[PDB]
Amino acid sequence: VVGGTEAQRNSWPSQISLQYRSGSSWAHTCGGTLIRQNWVMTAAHCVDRELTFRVVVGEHNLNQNNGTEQYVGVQKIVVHPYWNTDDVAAGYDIALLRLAQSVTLNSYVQLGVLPRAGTILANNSPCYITGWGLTRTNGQLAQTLQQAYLPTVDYAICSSSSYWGSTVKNSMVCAGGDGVRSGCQGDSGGPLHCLVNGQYAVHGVTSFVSRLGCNVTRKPTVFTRVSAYISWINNVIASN
Ligand code: NA
């Protein structure tokens, strides 16, 4: 997250860190949202590589013991069947991870609530992106979980020629684009939390930013629109 602030450690208890095994260590690669005690929602592109993945719930500082973490292996990966890794612009950038164990819930570990199917946010709706991704274009990962306030940009504006044009689809949410605050590499897969009727819900799964940089004016961060995939998510969980 470029232009973020440090999150309070109990603000976003559905945020997870998706990590891969790297030598004798683990490396953060993506975010995700805990949606059942044994299921995480993330981006499909996060799990393109043939790696050994784990999820960390209750994580705040990637580099220090928080005293709240639970570490769990990924047992099964179900990528959306229409996903195509060389065409992120087509959409379908979503995957479900079944965890090897069910995590225990507490103030640091909670299920993300998802929007009702079909919900579309008004332009300029209030949302926060969260994650450990780069804090500058071509920078380094955050140590502590970051948040940035990223107002939505509706489809009509986001798909206009000076924004994303054809690349953004109605199955996506755009947010931000002010040139200061954005998602960045390592935030993919994590949540966009939007405040609706007094309750935050996870309306987006972070999917992509500009090839020209993270915080680029009129290139809002682009998220998979969770409310377009409710039936898919429910069908996957029911059949696994
Ligand atoms: Na930690």
Describe the overall structure.
- The protein contains two helices and 14 strands; from the N terminus they run ββββββββββαββββα.
- It is mostly beta strands.
- The protein has two domains: 1-12 and 112-227, Trypsin-like serine proteases (Thrombin, subunit H), CATH 2.40.10.10; 13-111 and 228-240, Thrombin, subunit H (Beta Barrel), CATH 2.40.10.
- The radius of gyration is 16 Å and the shape is globular.
- It starts with a strand and ends with a helix.
- The structure holds sodium ion (NA).
- Sodium ion is lined by residues 59-61, 64-66, 69.
How is the topology of this model organized?
Layout (H helix, E strand, L loop, with lengths): L4 E2 L8 E8 L2 E12 L2 E4 L10 E5 L12 E10 L15 E5 L27 E5 L14 E4 L2 E2 L1 H4 L13 E4 L15 E6 L2 E10 L12 E5 L4 H9 L2
The structure holds sodium ion.
PDB class: hydrolase
Keywords: radiation damage, atomic resolution, hydrolase
Assembly: monomeric
What is this structure, in a nutshell?
This protein has helices at residues 155-158, 230-238, and strands at 5-6, 15-22, 25-36, 39-42, 53-57, 70-79, 95-99, 127-131, 146-149, 152-153, 172-175, 191-196, 199-208, 221-225. It is mainly beta and 240 residues long.
